[PDB]
From Swiss-Prot:
The lineage of its organism: Bacteria, Thermotogati, Deinococcota, Deinococci, Thermales. Belongs to the methyltransferase superfamily. PrmA family. This is Ribosomal protein L11 methyltransferase. It comes from the Bacteria. It comes from Thermus thermophilus (strain ATCC 27634 / DSM 579 / HB8). Methylates ribosomal protein L11. Preferentially recognizes free L11 before its incorporation into 50S subunits. This function is dispensable for growth and thermostability. The gene is prmA. Its main location: cytoplasm.
């Protein structure tokens, strides 16, 4: 698809608009002093505007513009360019490819409840590092691990913008134990993997430590309940949003 970028406002260009539709324009977007006309392909136009084919970049970039703050009491997730006039705790997460998922939200909310200032936290499957950052904002000391190294520079970049500095490390539970035990572990994964890690979870946490598990589809919540009960944990709390569930356990 091609874009015909013109300078001016819609109100301003309103005259020559009719001619763009004739020329077969199927879309028009006023974007910061410029009017963008969309065509399947370039045509001949006396408007002396510039042509350019639309790419993924442009989409994401456009997606980036429609992005709105996300509430997750006591936090608000924001784009480095967002402005918030509230009393909620700000989290700035560059929309990069590595915080609007229902599970992240349940995680944040649960973290605020189970995290105490001075707690050592393990963000298992840190991704953007958002939860990691959140824990520091609550006064905790955190470690973020992920088997995917691709995400680690972004996470650290994110921490930076949030004026906080968690420890980030490529790996999984095992990569983490040397920095434990921890007071709390927060894991946004999936029901079956939790079920398999249940036993290693209790070894990562000091007695009384907390385990916050999310990324759980409602229809698979039973697997975690059983895995955790058997791993010796005790249920503490349950939260859901859509088809997603978060389960809180105490060791
Ligand atoms: N076994 C494993 N150990 C560590 N990270 C894992 C893992 N399996 C998947 N992941 C990582 O899990 C992350 C899940 S999504 C990241 C979500 C973020 N912590 C939040 O709360 O929203 C991904 O970044 C993925 O790379």
């Amino acid at each position: 698809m091609w874009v015909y970028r013109l300078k001016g406002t819609l109100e301003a260009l309103d005259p020559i608009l009719p001619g763009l539709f004739d020329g077969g324009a199927r879309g028009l977007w006023e974007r910061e002093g410029e009017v963008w006309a969309f065509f399947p392909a370039p045509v001949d136009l006396p408007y002396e505007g510039v042509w350019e084919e639309v790419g993924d970049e442009d989409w994401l970039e456009a997606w980036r513009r429609d992005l709105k703050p996300a509430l997750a009491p006591p936090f608000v997730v924001l784009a480095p360019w967002h402005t918030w006039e509230g009393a909620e705790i700000p989290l700035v997460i560059e929309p990069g490819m590595a915080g609007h998922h229902e599970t992240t939200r349940l995680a944040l909310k649960a973290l605020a409840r189970h995290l105490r200032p001075g707690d050592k936290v393990l963000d298992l499957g840190t991704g953007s590092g958002v939860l990691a950052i959140a824990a520091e904002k609550l006064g905790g000391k955190a470690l973020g691990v992920d088997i995917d190294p691709m995400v680690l520079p972004q996470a650290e970049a994110n921490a930076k913008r949030n004026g906080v500095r968690p420890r980030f490390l490529e790996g999984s539970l095992e990569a983490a134990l040397p920095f434990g035990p921890f007071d709390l572990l927060v894991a946004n994964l999936y029901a079956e993997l939790h079920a398999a890690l249940a036993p290693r979870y209790r070894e990562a946490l000091v007695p009384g430590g907390r385990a916050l598990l999310t990324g759980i589809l409602k229809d698979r919540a039973p697997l975690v309940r059983e895995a955790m009960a058997g791993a010796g944990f005790r249920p503490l709390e349950e939260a859901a949003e859509g088809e997603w569930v978060l389960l809180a356990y105490g060791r």
